[PDB]
Design an enzyme around this catalytic site. Sequence first.
Site, short mmCIF file in Angstrom:
data_model
loop_
_atom_site.label_atom_id
_atom_site.label_comp_id
_atom_site.label_asym_id
_atom_site.label_seq_id
_atom_site.Cartn_x
_atom_site.Cartn_y
_atom_site.Cartn_z
N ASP A 19 -15.44 4.61 14.33
CA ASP A 19 -14.47 3.55 14.55
C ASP A 19 -13.09 4.12 14.25
O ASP A 19 -12.75 4.41 13.10
CB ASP A 19 -14.79 2.35 13.63
CG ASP A 19 -13.84 1.18 13.87
OD1 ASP A 19 -13.00 1.26 14.82
OD2 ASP A 19 -13.94 0.16 13.12
N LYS A 28 -61.52 -17.33 8.60
CA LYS A 28 -60.23 -16.68 8.40
C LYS A 28 -60.16 -15.91 7.07
O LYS A 28 -59.74 -14.75 7.02
CB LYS A 28 -59.09 -17.70 8.47
CG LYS A 28 -58.28 -17.68 9.77
CD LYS A 28 -59.08 -18.18 10.96
CE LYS A 28 -58.16 -18.55 12.11
NZ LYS A 28 -56.98 -19.30 11.62
N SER A 80 -17.64 3.75 6.90
CA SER A 80 -18.28 4.44 5.76
C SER A 80 -17.93 5.93 5.74
O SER A 80 -17.95 6.58 4.69
CB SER A 80 -19.81 4.26 5.79
OG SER A 80 -20.36 4.76 7.01
N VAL A 118 -62.28 -26.20 2.67
CA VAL A 118 -62.38 -24.96 3.42
C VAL A 118 -63.48 -25.06 4.48
O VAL A 118 -64.68 -24.98 4.16
CB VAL A 118 -62.69 -23.74 2.53
CG1 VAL A 118 -62.60 -22.47 3.35
CG2 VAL A 118 -61.72 -23.69 1.35
N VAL A 132 -29.61 -4.19 20.71
CA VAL A 132 -29.03 -3.59 21.90
C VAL A 132 -27.57 -4.05 21.97
O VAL A 132 -27.28 -5.25 21.84
CB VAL A 132 -29.79 -4.05 23.16
CG1 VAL A 132 -29.21 -3.42 24.43
CG2 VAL A 132 -31.29 -3.73 23.01
N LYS A 153 -66.17 -21.94 1.62
CA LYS A 153 -66.64 -22.93 2.59
C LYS A 153 -67.33 -24.12 1.91
O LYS A 153 -67.44 -25.20 2.48
CB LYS A 153 -67.57 -22.29 3.64
CG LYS A 153 -67.77 -23.16 4.89
CD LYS A 153 -68.56 -22.43 5.97
CE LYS A 153 -69.97 -22.06 5.50
NZ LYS A 153 -70.77 -21.33 6.54
N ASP A 190 -15.78 3.22 18.89
CA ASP A 190 -14.79 2.18 19.13
C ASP A 190 -13.44 2.76 18.78
O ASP A 190 -13.29 3.50 17.78
CB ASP A 190 -14.99 0.96 18.20
CG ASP A 190 -16.32 0.26 18.40
OD1 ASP A 190 -16.91 0.42 19.48
OD2 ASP A 190 -16.76 -0.47 17.48
N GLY A 221 -23.30 5.04 10.96
CA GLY A 221 -23.91 4.41 12.12
C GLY A 221 -23.16 4.68 13.43
O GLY A 221 -23.76 4.72 14.52
#
Length: 325
Positions: free
Chosen positions: A183, A63, A171, A56, A94, A51, A247, A180
Amino acid sequence: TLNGGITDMLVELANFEKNVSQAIHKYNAYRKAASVIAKYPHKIKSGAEAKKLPGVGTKIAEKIDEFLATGKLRKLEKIRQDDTSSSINFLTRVTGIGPSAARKLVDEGIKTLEDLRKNEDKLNHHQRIGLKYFEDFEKRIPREEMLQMQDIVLNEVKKLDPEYIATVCGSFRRGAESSGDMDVLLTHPNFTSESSKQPKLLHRVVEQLQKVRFITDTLSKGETKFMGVCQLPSENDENEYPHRRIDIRLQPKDQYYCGVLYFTGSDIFNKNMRAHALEKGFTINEYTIRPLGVTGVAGEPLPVDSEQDIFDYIQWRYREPKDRS
């Protein structure tokens, strides 16, 4: 450093007042405190010594004082939270909600999973089921369960018609210990790039998979691709198998292995393979491989009967999927 932690905190603070607030005279303030402290040749041990420094202020010392006690700052925590360009990237977790929709919800107040569930009227069907199985879709799928899912899918396909070909890609096909999602690439000799589009070759597989209770929800039912939700059969056990994303992609026979190749990938492997075809004067798509001339003039699609032909064309030895990192 002697004071890195303080100046790091201060500059980030400054960029908020210019990016988000457009309060450019607090940018300039926070910057001032960064420069002086950065030039101060001793290790600051509390907020009052700062300060003093001709940059400052009390509120900044207010802070800085926080940072040296905890090791963090409450002001910057909630700012890192409320970032418009990071709350958009959580809503995209999502299924159904791309950034297009993600923009449409954040500046209308809804930015959290609780707030997503505080306003389900603003989200379509695809997005709603994605929102419902969200935690389940977070989970990994152990290889053990992938192998079982594959059994079900591949057994049902073969029963329906011996002429169907189905390959579980991603994968999983690269031998990964977890996945994950699932497919499936599917083809049938009745469906070719010259032929008249055959949505029921896909529909019949999907429906059979629903009949035996494996497919439990449809997110997206197209003419050549299905996106949905699936679940292993249990008996009755505390937390049964979680819901999984699946999928199924119907490809023309004459373009199938180009597809399998692409969807099995690894991203990095596909890029490297494409650059290499390009060095040998070929272009590779998820559909075809073609000679490429001088200019980007591509020629006629070459015959592919297996992943091996594609490797042959660009002068590579076949790569096992496990080795396609």
